[PDB]
Design a binder for this molecule. Structure first.
Ligand SMILES: OC[C@@H]1O[C@@H](OC[C@@H]2O[C@@H](O)[C@H](O)[C@H]2O)[C@H](O)[C@H]1O
Length: 359
C-alpha cells in the first residue's frame, strides 16, 4: 500500500525546550526520495540545527542523514525551515541541488536572518550560500522589526524567496514581501506582495502554487482580516490571490477561503496543486487550526472550496506534498502545536489518496 496514517517521524528528547518541535516541511526529490525537516528546539549549546531525515519508501520509514548547521553566525538555524529542489540551474548551483532556507536567530531572539544553504548530494552534506534578509527581534509584536517564514519558488529564469516582514514598522505591523535572484548570491530589492493599510493588520505565512491555466495561487493568513468570530477581536483567516506573474500579487484582488458548508479556515496555511482530479487539477490547502483539507477544482473560484476529513491531526503550519509519480497521493506532515505544547509535539505524517478522501 502507498497510503498510511500517523506514521511517526521524530519523537523529541524530553530535554528539548517547549514546543520541542514545530514547523514540519517535506520535500520530494527527482529520484523519488523524500526529505523532511522541522524546527528542532534542543538545549544549547550546541546552537540549534535543522535536522534532515530521508525516506526511500514513500514516507513509511525514515532515517536522519544530516543536520543543516549555522556555519556563519554562531547563532543557530532556529525557525521556519523550508526545503526546495532546484528545477533548473542558478549560478553555480545545478538542477537538482537541494536548498534549505530558514531563519538564523541567536538564543536570546534579538535578531532574525533568513539564510539559504545548499546540498549537492541530495541532502547528506550542506554549504552556506547566502544571507537573504536581516530583521530585528524575533517576537511577533507590533513595532518590532523581525523577518520570518521563507518560501521558495522558481519563475522562468528567477528564483523567488517570499517571506513575512515587520521592518516597515511605521506603516505595517507585518506585511508580505519577496526578493528574487538569478544566481543565489545577489538578491533583488525587497518587493511587496501583500499589505494592508490598517497598521495593525498582519498578513503572514506565504506559500504559492502553480495552476495549469498558467496562473499562480498565493496563500497566506490575513492577521486582522474582517469578521473575527464571536469572542475574538483579532483572527487569521486564510486568504489568497491569483496572478499570471507570481511577482505581482500586490495588485490582485484577495479572496477568503470558505468551504461550501461555511467553514472558515484560519491560521498558518499551506497550499499545493496536484495534476489529479480533472482538467483543472486540484488545489489543496491546509490551515493550522483544523484537521481537514480544503480543495478547489476550479482554479481558485471563490465559490468552489470543498472540505474533507483526513486522519492527520491539526498542527501549526501543517504542510503538504503531492507525489510526482502519483498525483492522487497527498502527504500531510505536521510537528504539533504552538507552545505551550505540554510536551506533546512529535513530527509525523500521513499519506492519503485524494480519490478516497474526496468522497
Ligand atoms: O515558527 C516559530 C514561531 O514563529 C513566531 O511567530 C511568527 C509569526 O507567526 C505567524 O503566524 C506570523 O506571520 C509571524 O509574525 C513565534 O514566536 C514562534 O513560535
Amino acid at each position: 500500500g502507498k497510503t498510511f496514517s500517523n506514521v511517526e517521524i521524530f519523537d523529541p528528547p524530553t530535554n528539548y525546550r517547549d514546543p520541542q518541535v514545530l514547523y514540519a516541511r517535506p520535500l520530494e526529490l527527482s529520484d523519488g526520495t523524500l526529505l523532511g525537516t522541522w524546527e528542532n528546539y534542543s538545549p544549547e549549546p550546541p546552537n540549534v540545527w535543522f535536522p534532515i531525515v530521508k525516506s526511500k519508501d514513500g514516507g513509511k520509514t525514515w532515517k536522519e542523514i544530516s543536520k543543516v548547521k549555522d556555519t556563519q553566525n554562531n547563532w543557530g538555524l532556529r525557525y521556519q525551515p523550508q526545503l526546495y529542489e532546484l528545477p533548473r540551474a542558478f549560478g553555480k548551483y545545478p538542477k537538482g541541488t537541494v536548498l534549505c532556507s530558514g531563519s538564523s536567530i541567536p538564543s536570546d531572539l534579538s535578531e532574525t536572518l533568513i539564510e539559504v544553504y545548499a546540498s549537492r548530494d541530495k541532502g547528506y552534506t550542506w554549504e552556506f550560500v547566502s544571507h537573504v534578509a536581516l530583521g530585528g527581534e524575533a517576537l511577533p509584536n507590533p513595532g518590532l522589526t523581525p523577518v520570518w517564514e521563507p518560501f521558495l519558488m522558481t519563475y522562468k529564469e528567477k528564483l523567488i524567496l517570499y517571506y513575512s516582514d515587520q521592518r516597515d514598522n511605521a506603516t505595517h505591523s507585518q506585511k508580505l514581501v519577496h526578493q528574487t535572484t538569478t544566481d543565489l548570491k545577489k538578491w533583488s530589492k525587497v518587493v511587496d506582495d501583500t499589505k494592508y493599510a490598517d497598521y495593525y493588520a498582519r498578513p503572514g505565512m506565504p506559500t504559492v502554487a502553480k495552476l495549469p491555466n498558467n496562473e499562480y495561487i498565493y496563500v497566506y493568513e490575513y492577521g486582522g482580516g474582517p469578521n473575527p468570530p464571536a469572542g475574538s477581536d483579532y483572527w487569521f483567516p486564510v486568504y489568497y490571490r491569483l496572478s499570471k506573474d507570481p511577482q505581482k500579487f500586490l495588485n490582485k484582488a484577495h479572496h477568503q477561503i470558505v468551504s461550501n458548508d461555511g467553514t472558515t479556515p484560519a491560521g498558518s496555511p499551506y497550499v499545493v496543486w496536484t495534476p489529479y482530479g480533472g482538467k483543472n487539477g486540484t488545489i489543496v490547502v491546509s490551515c493550522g487550526t483544523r484537521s481537514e483539507i480544503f480543495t478547489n477544482q476550479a482554479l481558485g473560484d471563490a465559490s468552489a472550496w470543498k472540505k474533507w476529513d483526513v486522519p492527520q491531526p491539526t498542527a501549526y503550519t501543517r504542510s503538504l506534498l503531492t507525489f510526482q509519480k502519483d498525483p492522487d497521493l497527498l502527504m500531510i506532515m505536521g510537528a504539533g502545536i504552538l507552545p505551550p505544547a505540554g510536551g506533546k509535539n512529535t513530527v509525523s505524517a500521513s499519506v492519503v489518496r485524494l480519490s478516497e478522501v474526496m468522497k
